[PDB]
Ligand SMILES: CCn1cc(NC(=O)C2CCCC2)cn1
Ligand SMILES: [Zn+2]
Ligand SMILES: [Zn+2]
């Protein structure tokens with residue numbers, strides 16, 4: 001049980017308005033044949049065009065919502081809509097394109113998918129709310145066959161060119177005209193009552209129905225993300241490394257230790273309330289403080305209400321000491337907090353569009369995160385950049401930068417004994433620059449840092465006496 005059997009039943013009720021008379025009894029094997037595709041009894045890595053919900057969740061980075069609306073069907077123009085916001089009009093002869101024949105429409109489809117997916121996935125998963133026209137339009141831009149590799153690299157082939165008779169991945173498909181061996185899933189097969197808009201609108205108010213195919217494509221992908229990542233969560237599923245995952249995660253650990261150690265040194269809190277990951281470890285193990293942990297899994301639907309996390313009778317006095325919320329999304333942070341909150345609006349290859357303003361952050365695991373809301377931080381301020389270190393001023397080993405290329409560091413934010421004494425040493429200059437790179441990496445990945453209003457790095461200078 002790995003792939004979806006072609007002999008699995010496909011429910012056809014959603015298809016009968018576009019395809020009247022369609023048999024109630026239908027398999028994927030018969031549906032694919034009706035779509036104009038021939039599988040030829042082939043055991044070459046592509047057993048079915050359709051995939052299971054479990055296979056779709058493993059390939060969420062490949063998801064592209066797709067919808068087709070009749071403009072007027074061999075005689076009528078079709079409006080092809082994608083969750084990228086693109087609408088194309090194919091004549092049989094929010095970006096809205098005018099009617100053009102299939103031979104040019106298919107070139108645009110290949111360019112659009114390749115640019116969207118080349119840094120995300122090795123494939124495309126068309127996410128549908130199948131009513132008929134989208135399935136019967138596939139033969140005009142899709143070719144299938146055995147699994148193949150790119151003509152310029154080792155990656156699996158996703159495109160085909162009729163001009164050259166060659167195959168390419170998303171990175172090398174310029175000038176290609178056919179989508180090759182795409183995958184697809186029909187959300188209607190999951191058991192829903194009522195139409196797409198009524199189901200989507202139960203969980204999301206950010207995607208309206210501007211009555212175009214791309215709006216339906218967007219809503220379909222949104223509903224699928226809600227079902228697979230919001231109401232249902234699976235953190236066991238691992239996702240491949242596609243970018244700066246490791247550097248970002250290492251930076252996150254460095255920044256957390258730096259900020260918490262400095263808050264404890266500057267304000268000397270007798271107790272720290274660490275709220276979040278039930279598997280968390282003390283980020284500052286040498287700190288004198290009474291460290292208390294509170295279990296809260298990452299919220300994927302709405303941000304936690306602070307009244308439910310803190311109230312209903314723990315140290316009980318969360319007002320004593322400091323509260324640490326490291327990626328623990330709450331509606332309104334208490335004034336005595338240290339906070340790391342992912343900004344869902346960030347544009348990156350790790351952050352995928354999500355449900356109801358939320359985003360799907362995929363870094364080793366998939367985490368649907370509720371919409372970023374500035375009002376959650378009303379009791380705090382933005383945490384400014386600083387580097388603090390009490391370690392001895394001593395270089396050690398071969399230096400990365402040569403003596404002639406090295407410039408001594410000058411910075412008001414290098415909080416060290418050497419900078420207090422008027423001249424930053426080589427070791428602290430190296431560590432400052434490495435820390436600044438890690439910090440910038442974390443910020444640019446979408447993380448935002450917030451702190452209690454009394455936080456002042458001026459209080460760190462007296463820890464050198
Ligand atoms: C032009 C100024 N300047 C930057 C550095 N950079 C470095 O030493 C980094 C930090 C340790 C690894 C390499 C030296 N000098
Ligand atoms: Zn390639
Ligand atoms: Zn939505």
Ligand SMILES: [Zn+2]
Nearest residue numbers: 393418425428
């Ligand atoms: Zn130093």
